[PDB]
Curated annotation (Swiss-Prot), chain A:
Present with 2840 molecules/cell in log phase SD medium. Disulfide bonds: none annotated. This is THO complex subunit THP2. Transmembrane segments: none annotated. Component the THO subcomplex of the TREX complex, which operates in coupling transcription elongation to mRNA export. The THO complex is recruited to transcribed genes and moves along the gene with the elongating polymerase during transcription. THO is important for stabilizing nascent RNA in the RNA polymerase II elongation complex by preventing formation of DNA:RNA hybrids behind the elongating polymerase. Component of the THO complex, which is composed of HPR1, MFT1, THO2 and THP2. Together with SUB2, TEX1 and YRA1, THO forms the transcription/export (TREX) complex. THO associates with DNA and RNA in vitro. It comes from Saccharomyces cerevisiae (strain ATCC 204508 / S288c). The gene is THP2. It is found in: Nucleus. The lineage of its organism: Eukaryota, Fungi, Dikarya, Ascomycota, Saccharomycotina. The chain holds residues 158 to 209 of 261 of the full protein.
UniProtKB/Swiss-Prot annotation, chain B:
It is found in: Nucleus. This is THO complex subunit MFT1. Present with 5910 molecules/cell in log phase SD medium. Component the THO subcomplex of the TREX complex, which operates in coupling transcription elongation to mRNA export. The THO complex is recruited to transcribed genes and moves along the gene with the elongating polymerase during transcription. THO is important for stabilizing nascent RNA in the RNA polymerase II elongation complex by preventing formation of DNA:RNA hybrids behind the elongating polymerase. It comes from Saccharomyces cerevisiae (strain ATCC 204508 / S288c). Component of the THO complex, which is composed of HPR1, MFT1, THO2 and THP2. Together with SUB2, TEX1 and YRA1, THO forms the transcription/export (TREX) complex. THO associates with DNA and RNA in vitro.
Amino acid sequence: EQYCAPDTDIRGVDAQIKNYLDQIKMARAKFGLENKYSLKERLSTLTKELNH
Amino acid sequence: KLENLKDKLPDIKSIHSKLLLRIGKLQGLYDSVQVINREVEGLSEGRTS
């Protein structure tokens, strides 16, 4: 909405995308690693030891 | 009334220069949306670094 609202420079809001476009994989590699194996193998052995 | 046509000319130079400004703004919104659609395509390929 800040591209069309008046009294703004175009290049100052084009740099708010490069901030936003790198904050979207700094939250997709923070839940794509702690959900990868550190919470997979906590559910691997614990579902075997529940069955036994 | 057509003799002068002098102080009626720069008020059309004003509204024509704002319209060429509003064109270049919304031509820039359709060039940063096409940056978001180049990242989401490449990221959902599977290759991140």
